[PDB]
Amino acid sequence: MNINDNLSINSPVDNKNVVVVRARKTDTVFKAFKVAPNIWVAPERYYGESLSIDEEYKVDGGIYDSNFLSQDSEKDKFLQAIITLLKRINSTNAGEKLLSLISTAIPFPYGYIGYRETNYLSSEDNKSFYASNIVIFGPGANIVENNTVFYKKEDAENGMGTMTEIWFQPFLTYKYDEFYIDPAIELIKCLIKSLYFLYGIKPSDDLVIPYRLRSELENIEYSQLNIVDLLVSGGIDPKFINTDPYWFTDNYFSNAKKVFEDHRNIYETEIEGNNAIGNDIKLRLKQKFRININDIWELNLNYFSKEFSIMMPDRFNNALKHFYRKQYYKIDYPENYSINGFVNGQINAQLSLSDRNQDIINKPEEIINLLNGNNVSLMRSNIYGDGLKSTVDDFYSNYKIPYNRADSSLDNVNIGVIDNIPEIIDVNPYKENCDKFSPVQKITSTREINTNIPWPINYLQAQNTNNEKFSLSSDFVEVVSSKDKSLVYSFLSNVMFYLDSIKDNSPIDTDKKYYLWLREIFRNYSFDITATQEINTNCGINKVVTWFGKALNILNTSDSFVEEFQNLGAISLINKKENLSMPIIESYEIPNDMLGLPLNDLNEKLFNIYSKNTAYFKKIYYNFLDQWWTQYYSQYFDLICMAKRSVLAQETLIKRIIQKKLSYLIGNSNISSDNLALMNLTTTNTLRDISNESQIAMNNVDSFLNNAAICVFESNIYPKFISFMEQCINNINIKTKEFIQKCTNINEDEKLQLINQNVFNSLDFEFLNIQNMKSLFSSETALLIKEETWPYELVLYAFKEPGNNVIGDASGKNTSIEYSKDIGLVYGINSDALYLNGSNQSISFSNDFFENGLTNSFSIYFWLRNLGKDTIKSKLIGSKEDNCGWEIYFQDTGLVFNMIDSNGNEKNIYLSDVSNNSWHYITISVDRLKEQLLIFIDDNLVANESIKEILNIYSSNIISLLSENNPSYIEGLTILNKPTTSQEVLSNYFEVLNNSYIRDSNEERLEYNKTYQLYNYVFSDKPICEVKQNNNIYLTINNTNNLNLQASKFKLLSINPNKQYVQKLDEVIISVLDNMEKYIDISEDNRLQLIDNKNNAKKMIISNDIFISNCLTLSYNGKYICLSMKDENHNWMICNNDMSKYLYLWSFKP
């Protein structure tokens, strides 16, 4: 937004927004650009760290380049990139507040020996000083590591506040699961942390909580994380430390709040209103103190993740180096990334791999040496540490849970007010405002350990080859003992089986043969990788990943991993089973000063102790939950990551196999040039289909393993808690009974009632909530991912604005819509429907998915009402190019669904009787895994066919809705990337159908004051007619063929003039036009008759059956309306409850 855009690396020094300033007290100088008040960008490498460092000091996962950001071209690209990111952050209210706060967050000034500011940059000549809170540099030595440093440690810890330097890397990002890290949130993290430095609230380096149990190591060792980073970094982890009530504290919090008030006070009494100071400072201060210290502690990435709809890693996100090997991708501004973030979002952005990936330093935490019986090395695998500092030592054992207790954080930031504070111009500099910057040096220790039993990291490593030629094998021992060594380890049974079945076959020559091959390759991969089996466990039914044991070598010694896991339980999957440490408590003593109190006071004082206690219980439980997360979940998340890596390794093998075959045919074969072209385009789509299938599998292992971890809490941790708690309340119960007996000033009847009031039982501490356990893993990110990856490729919406008709796509995909300007909208079934006139009107939807291919599945559905005239075959909707793809046609009285591949194979299927000028729900389902086509009309399944004979349907990326020659209505058009089942169709159809509206015979909304004819469900072609008997007139139907009774004309009336459409439960008056207007009444015989006087008219309740879409029911005083027995012969309309259910269904036809 209004971040300063006017800068380039060649911008001249103006001494206002572009300066050349000294770095701390060094001899070194650098150029800085002011992008916002008090906020500068210095587009070079951080000055404080040497660019070339000794090999011994290079950290794992680091990339070291001394010539990076050396050139002017690079520097500008940097400067623009940061400016771009700050613009994105400022373009959303949340991040706009963050920047505004940071801007006004200037550190507290020192006093006379008038006031001296510590936040400024010095000109080289040291006669000019520029206000700065924040300065953003490029990386230090390691060019993938962001950093946030303080100008002066003392001022960062003492409540004054200190300037903050940031080291940032806009040009590289990595993939985590299905998404790219968004540098915008990575920068927001650095910015949030600076808040701690600007306020002078930086905690001791020693204030540190347990993060991850290092379950990789033979010994007991924890990784720790400073409170600052935990609170800022977001994700799930913090939910365990930050709790209500708090089980974890430190003087830091209470003291920070204390000093903050001291400084606020110094401001209030002295600085504010002091004319010796000036607004650019005191006004900013006033805003800095509108905040509460708690607001900063409560502020973190999870909040911006949500406000910006940015995906971020949500679990152990400061330990990722251990769980993951990062692969870096280049980001170019603004081609890849702009003020709206990644072009095409974090999932589908097209980013190039960095050539730097090969320069990444690899320094394992430990190395797993796998030998054989002869003590010779088969394999050496790497395990990487998280980077965090460790122990020392065990926190849970020595931590006492305190018995005595002593959303939005940016709400109080005012953007308008802050933006009107003149910039700080005259600065009176405080001389020593900074520390000599001292670079951190780190030597990385590596452990070698030997095993005759393959670890998961071994089985993983065996799933990679650099061999251009390789063979899949299911024997791990054979793979690593290979005399080839061409073998690579694979669990894909269906794929390996298929590859073997075709081993002896004549080579692939036709394109048709390539497709048949590629398709079977795809189906089998899907079957292998998405395999799950539901099992009964201690805690329930879990959907188990079938190949898990064969992948990681876990419970793999059986012939089946699944049954062995059902047997041994969730805890059998991890290496360290007993990590718990019973927490140290605060022992229970009731004061000796209450011994003589009177009842009322004794009473209400034990009530206080009762609450403190039950709160204390809750704290203990929390402590157990944190240990679970740290000690146990950490190990299941390791399993999740390794399992996910296994899936990628396998996927890679598959793609390489496919790529080789395609590459080979293109290399030497007689396949037509144009043919190869299609093959290339098509295979690409298949490779996407393979990732989508891989993704389903990576979700499978996430649910499976998360459930397991939760089962371990119920089955293993929780019961240890319950043990500890009944020892605890057994004690408390004792001491409280002994206390009450020793009470002097109360009687014996009082003692018994009191002991009873104050006694604890197990229910007081049974806190397990399984739904809460499960909800832990639903983060903003998990949700965002769901919405980005759901099956909708097109969801058509339409509505009427004043003077405008709106049509759009809600799928959240890339769909582009182009349509005739004059297309009209009309209310359909549940919403506005598009009207196509058949002549000039058309609409078209564009999505790369729409082209289909060989291997993808999809569903098309929509509501359609056709004013049916001609029988002649006419395009309605379809996607076709080069005579491939699919089309739905109007033909005869029906539709035709057509499907045709590049080899000429066709589906041409007539769907009878769809143009009655009544709404119909069309569902078409194409399933390549089951090779099955399904076509539904309304609630019926009209076609079920094999499509094994249809191969490559690649079409354009455009679906065209033409509706040639047949004016029609189309509503709720949807495209899905998955097949549809019959349950889903029924659910879609009926759910949409009950919106409270009653419908006419055509399923259009029933209207008041509109003329209809009335028909009973049982005789559907016979309209109600009027007949007089004794000088008065009744309602019947015509069973004497052409007795020339005239169809009677009906109109529904409402007590409310403003009411237009008829709804479920409405009160109604039925009228008829004969000579005058006649209104319906009930006789004493319960036979309906037309009368003279609206006053006497009976008010009836109209309603409908949820499963009968075009029909309605009518009742009076609970008595429903139906057709009588034969009489005259005539069948009278009667109010009676004893007839067959079918006779109570009516419909109005206009």
Place this chain on the structure above:
Amino acid sequence: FIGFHQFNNIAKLVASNWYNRQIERSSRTLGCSWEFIPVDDGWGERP
């Protein structure tokens, strides 16, 4: 639909067709979803 929008620092109640362009449940955080709280004996603070 009735919802709210930031104007300066004020969150003003708004009818905006931007909602009607959206699919049903999107996130858990809508802005066009409301609750109607009647005075109830079961809650009973001082109005």
